[PDB]
Amino acid sequence: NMINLTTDKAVYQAGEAVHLNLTLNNTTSLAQNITATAEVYSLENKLKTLQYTKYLLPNESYTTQKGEFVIPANSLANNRGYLLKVNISDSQNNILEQGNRAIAVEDDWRTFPRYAAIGGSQKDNNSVLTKNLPDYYRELEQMKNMNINSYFFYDVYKSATNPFPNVPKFDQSWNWWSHSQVETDAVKALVNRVHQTGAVAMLYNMILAQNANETAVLPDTEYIYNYETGGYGQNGQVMTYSPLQYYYNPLSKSWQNYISNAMAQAMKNGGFDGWQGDTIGDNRVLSHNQKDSRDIAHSFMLSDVYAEFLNKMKEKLPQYYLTLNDVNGENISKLANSKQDVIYNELWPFGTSALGNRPQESYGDLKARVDQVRQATGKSLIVGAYMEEPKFDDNRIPLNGAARDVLASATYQTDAVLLTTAAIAAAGGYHMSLAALANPNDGGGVGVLETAYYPTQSLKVSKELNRKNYHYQQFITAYENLLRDKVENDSAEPQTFTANGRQLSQDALGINGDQVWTYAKKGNDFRTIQLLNLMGITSDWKNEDGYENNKTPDEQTNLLVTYPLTGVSMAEADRIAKQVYLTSPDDWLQSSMISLATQVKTNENGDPVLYIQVPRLTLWDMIYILEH
Ligand SMILES: OC[C@H]1O[C@H](OC[C@H]2O[C@H](OC[C@H]3O[C@H](OC[C@H]4O[C@@H](O)[C@H](O)[C@@H](O)[C@@H]4O)[C@H](O)[C@@H](O)[C@@H]3O)[C@H](O)[C@@H](O)[C@@H]2O)[C@H](O)[C@@H](O)[C@@H]1O
Ligand SMILES: OC[C@H]1O[C@H](OC[C@H]2O[C@H](O)[C@H](O)[C@@H](O)[C@@H]2O)[C@H](O)[C@@H](O)[C@@H]1O
């Protein structure tokens, strides 16, 4: 629509007023009063109705000014998501335009992280440049209105041991493919704009690395050595990425001191709020004093000392946020007690699934990883799950279907991206998918991460995907309390049927496609049922095949969902049955919430069972059931 609803910030403290600006357009041929109505909802409850009316001539528009739409300080509870439902109507109450916008109120980003990337521009050798600020700014306005509360600044650093010096420009000289440069004033402008929105800025940097094209900052007593000759060189040899990088022992007091101090100054120079920690990978290793030993009990695994290393960084950088990418997410058990402010895992389909002996290649393996992290830590997993990743050989020969799409100048497959975002969010996580890259292929909106090198956008973001990403972000914010606020897997097993009794929910794990993937969650006060549409489609989350493997599932209508009230008396069942709602970020609802027709019956076991009527399922529905 053209409401161009905007807020003054991405996120609010409870003691803050929300300033809304919206445009009333007389898109009719008649001069008349045009009314904007904004209903404030907290889940199913309408808290307030705001409104504003102006007489407008045909084609005349008016953007509200500071003060005309305001949610006053202290009217909303802390650490909650709200939904503003906006309608612009004419003087006969016809609806001319409509749009829904979430509002996030929170102390800070760590409870419900909604993390987006910022990186260099492909059209400029991947550089971060002052001249690209207008495009970054337009992208950041969109991110702000999607309630983004944090940004991962990808490759804005000089070298791993000298991350952000006070110089006007440096060369990421380690970058041989594009010879990117960083203008530091551009990085600072971006950090400042992020801060105006109320968001935080995280600096990406490795935690153990010393670049190739530079000199050792410490002597070799502080390096880490290979136990076994393999991918990183010979046993008794300094742990070497190949020749590009060596690595220090995480138990080296001198390295800990060095990198903590280097990062303290870098973050201070940029105005960064914390450190997005990275590592390449795990290795069995020896200290310098053990480097000639062959006794495996004198060796150790890197991931085994990550926690203690992070705890040192936290102690040494107390005012800064901290997280460490656990590639594939395999070490939560070792990292559970570490002083990370948020949990971040980059997930690849070839990693081992939290479900056990299978690759994490399906939507259900994404849920399993989110769940495993919540069980271990109480926190919402931020997931890096890059979409499609078109790959070519050395002669531009497409190696997957997504690369064939690239050659056809095609778009990301919209529903493939949305389905992965839904899978992660429905489980209680957050899919870090959106990027501000000043990249032409994003068509004026935000980009979708496609590969570990964030700046790369080989496919175009259609206007459809851009608009639906926006709806999805609103849904993820507005319903955060239902998705990931003291919300756990439910032992009760809902199922989904066609209006004729054909069972559609076939695999609650979400490993298999061609189903309505159906499972329940429980909160203190309520139950939810996630329905994810995989009818007629496969369950692979990455869609490496692009459009060769269609990811638009068969739309469903008039579904029946059953939900057993295992504990419950027949008394509360008829109460509960009157308080069943559904919401969806898909076009038919766009986070609006509707009342569902429900009957109570009794199942094979003897419990009461809700028979819930679901009008429509496009990609993702959430049923919400109040139990008090
Ligand atoms: O034109 C050639 C080529 O350009 C792009 O790929 C370039 C390379 O990008 C990546 O390597 C650069 C990357 O290396 C380190 O980190 C690697 C990796 O580590 C993970 O833990 C993290 O989650 C990732 O996001 C991260 O990239 C540095 O720490 C980092 O600063 C630096 O950016 C990638 O690993 C290489 O394979 C690529 O060669 C285009 O993407 C590609 O189309 C094109 O072929
Ligand atoms: O009188 C008809 C008129 O009444 C309402 O609006 C009243 C009034 O509201 C504001 O003060 C505006 O600035 C004025 O132009 C309006 O007349 C209804 O909202 C409207 O639809 C209707 O035309």
Side-chain angles (χ1 to χ4, degrees):
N1 56 71
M2 314 169 85
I3 304 168
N4 190 49
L5 182 50
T6 62
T7 50
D8 66 314
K9 305 205 166 291
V11 299
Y12 295 88
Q13 302 283 336
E16 273 190 295
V18 179
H19 296 92
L20 298 153
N21 296 95
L22 74 90
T23 305
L24 291 73
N25 300 294
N26 189 354
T27 52
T28 80
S29 53
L30 183 68
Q32 58 182 309
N33 284 310
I34 298 297
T35 295
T37 305
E39 296 176 317
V40 186
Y41 275 84
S42 177
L43 308 178
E44 85 288 357
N45 292 134
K46 192 163 60 65
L47 293 181
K48 273 187 216 323
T49 302
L50 308 173
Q51 88 122 261
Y52 180 89
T53 295
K54 197 172 159 58
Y55 184 92
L56 292 174
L57 306 177
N59 281 295
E60 191 186 7
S61 274
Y62 172 81
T63 300
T64 58
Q65 306 152 245
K66 293 98 204 305
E68 314 187 279
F69 276 97
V70 174
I71 302 149
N74 305 308
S75 31
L76 302 177
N78 203 1
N79 303 303
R80 292 210 61 100
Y82 298 91
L83 191 69
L84 276 20
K85 286 184 58 184
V86 185
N87 290 78
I88 310 304
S89 52
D90 64 19
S91 69
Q92 298 293 109
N93 302 319
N94 303 304
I95 304 305
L96 303 178
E97 330 198 44
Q98 281 190 130
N100 301 324
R101 162 63 192 272
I103 293 297
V105 181
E106 52 193 26
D107 296 313
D108 64 57
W109 75 296
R110 290 175 292 173
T111 303
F112 301 117
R114 293 182 306 280
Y115 204 25
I118 290 177
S121 177
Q122 205 166 353
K123 78 178 189 213
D124 293 308
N125 285 8
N126 296 318
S127 286
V128 186
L129 291 182
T130 292
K131 70 160 147 75
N132 293 335
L133 288 177
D135 293 334
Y136 282 126
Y137 290 152
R138 184 187 60 253
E139 290 155 9
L140 292 175
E141 177 70 12
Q142 298 179 67
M143 297 284 205
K144 168 199 62 176
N145 294 309
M146 286 184 301
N147 317 294
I148 293 293
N149 59 21
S150 47
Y151 294 83
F152 179 147
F153 279 67
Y154 182 88
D155 277 14
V156 303
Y157 69 98
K158 165 92 185 293
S159 75
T161 38
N162 181 20
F164 200 75
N166 282 316
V167 298
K169 189 184 146 214
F170 56 76
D171 267 304
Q172 310 181 288
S173 52
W174 48 267
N175 176 349
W176 28 269
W177 49 91
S178 75
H179 320 286
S180 45
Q181 332 109 91
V182 183
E183 288 172 330
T184 61
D185 277 16
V187 179
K188 292 173 189 183
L190 291 177
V191 172
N192 292 342
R193 178 58 52 93
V194 159
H195 291 158
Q196 314 166 37
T197 75
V200 296
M202 299 286 281
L203 179 63
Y204 169 90
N205 194 35
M206 296 275 289
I207 52 149
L208 304 176
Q210 160 82 71
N211 272 132
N213 68 160
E214 295 185 343
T215 311
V217 294
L218 290 157
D220 57 23
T221 54
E222 317 306 313
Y223 286 110
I224 200 60
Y225 295 82
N226 299 308
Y227 178 69
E228 282 127 325
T229 299
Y232 303 104
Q234 260 84 40
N235 48 88
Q237 151 147 90
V238 174
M239 178 184 161
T240 316
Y241 171 86
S242 286
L244 285 312
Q245 306 197 139
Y246 17 121
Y247 304 98
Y248 291 95
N249 185 343
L251 295 186
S252 163
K253 282 194 228 275
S254 67
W255 168 245
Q256 292 174 355
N257 290 342
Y258 182 91
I259 193 58
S260 61
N261 184 83
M263 289 300 288
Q265 194 62 53
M267 294 186 289
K268 183 188 195 298
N269 292 351
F272 291 96
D273 303 276
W275 184 3
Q276 173 70 37
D278 201 27
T279 0
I280 25 91
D282 205 6
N283 186 12
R284 180 157 287 278
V285 285
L286 305 162
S287 68
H288 177 88
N289 299 160
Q290 297 295 344
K291 63 159 171 135
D292 292 336
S293 167
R294 316 300 316 125
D295 178 349
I296 198 161
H298 289 199
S299 84
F300 67 87
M301 208 74 202
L302 284 180
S303 56
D304 286 332
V305 292
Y306 288 171
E308 155 185 351
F309 176 90
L310 293 173
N311 293 339
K312 298 273 170 258
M313 300 301 95
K314 179 54 88 161
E315 302 195 348
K316 292 163 188 285
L317 300 161
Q319 75 266 55
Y320 293 102
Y321 304 104
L322 178 65
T323 195
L324 180 67
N325 172 22
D326 181 22
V327 175
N328 275 326
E330 310 297 355
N331 292 125
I332 201 60
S333 60
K334 310 191 189 171
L335 292 156
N337 300 308
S338 66
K339 290 172 160 199
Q340 290 188 80
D341 292 291
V342 293
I343 313 294
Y344 178 86
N345 296 170
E346 175 183 65
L347 308 179
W348 300 96
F350 57 72
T352 297
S353 163
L355 288 174
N357 191 47
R358 52 167 288 100
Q360 66 195 343
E361 61 79 45
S362 83
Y363 305 114
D365 305 292
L366 304 174
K367 171 177 186 298
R369 186 112 283 151
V370 166
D371 291 346
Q372 178 185 79
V373 172
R374 173 175 69 254
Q375 278 163 27
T377 65
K379 298 175 184 192
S380 184
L381 180 62
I382 309 169
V383 175
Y386 319 136
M387 287 298 302
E388 305 194 50
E389 197 172 40
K391 277 172 319 210
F392 288 92
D393 68 2
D394 39 340
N395 286 299
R396 262 83 190 285
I397 304 308
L399 292 180
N400 50 29
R404 279 182 290 282
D405 285 349
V406 164
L407 301 178
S409 310
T411 60
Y412 289 100
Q413 176 164 211
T414 295
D415 287 349
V417 172
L418 296 169
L419 273 170
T420 298
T421 290
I424 292 149
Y430 182 87
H431 184 207
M432 178 199 71
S433 174
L434 304 186
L437 311 161
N439 193 301
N441 271 350
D442 297 330
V446 314
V448 170
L449 301 172
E450 78 165 62
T451 187
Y453 195 70
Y454 293 176
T456 303
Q457 296 286 269
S458 323
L459 290 166
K460 294 166 163 39
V461 180
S462 75
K463 306 318 129 96
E464 186 186 352
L465 181 53
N466 199 56
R467 187 181 68 244
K468 288 182 177 175
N469 269 333
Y470 174 95
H471 295 157
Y472 272 54
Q473 299 298 305
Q474 307 307 330
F475 188 78
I476 293 165
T477 305
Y479 295 113
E480 66 194 5
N481 302 105
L482 302 185
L483 293 165
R484 51 168 177 174
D485 186 3
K486 291 168 171 60
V487 162
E488 300 297 340
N489 292 328
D490 185 350
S491 63
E493 287 161 38
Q495 298 303 334
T496 302
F497 304 89
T498 64
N500 280 149
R502 186 193 148 204
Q503 188 168 330
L504 302 189
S505 42
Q506 290 291 306
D507 169 31
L509 298 179
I511 288 168
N512 301 148
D514 196 31
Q515 60 159 334
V516 178
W517 181 24
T518 303
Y519 62 84
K521 303 290 289 275
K522 64 164 311 173
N524 127 63
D525 230 355
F526 60 93
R527 297 302 181 273
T528 62
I529 298 159
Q530 305 298 333
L531 309 180
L532 293 128
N533 201 355
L534 316 177
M535 297 294 301
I537 67 168
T538 61
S539 66
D540 69 296
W541 61 260
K542 199 167 163 159
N543 186 213
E544 300 181 64
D545 302 296
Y547 285 104
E548 310 207 310
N549 179 38
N550 165 65
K551 282 291 196 170
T552 295
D554 293 334
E555 194 168 37
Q556 305 294 308
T557 49
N558 308 314
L559 297 184
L560 160 78
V561 175
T562 63
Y563 181 75
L565 299 164
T566 304
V568 179
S569 68
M570 189 82 202
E572 214 203 343
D574 308 78
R575 172 213 258 182
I576 309 183
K578 256 187 167 116
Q579 310 197 285
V580 180
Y581 302 88
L582 184 146
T583 181
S584 170
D586 301 318
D587 292 349
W588 73 290
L589 285 183
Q590 301 175 30
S591 301
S592 269
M593 173 165 280
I594 57 172
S595 222
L596 304 181
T598 300
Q599 293 177 286
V600 189
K601 303 185 179 203
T602 77
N603 67 191
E604 280 206 63
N605 301 354
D607 293 314
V609 178
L610 308 184
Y611 275 56
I612 300 170
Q613 294 304 136
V614 176
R616 185 166 303 270
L617 173 67
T618 296
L619 300 186
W620 179 24
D621 287 348
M622 168 167 65
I623 298 174
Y624 166 49
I625 304 162
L626 283 79
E627 287 183 354
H628 304 318

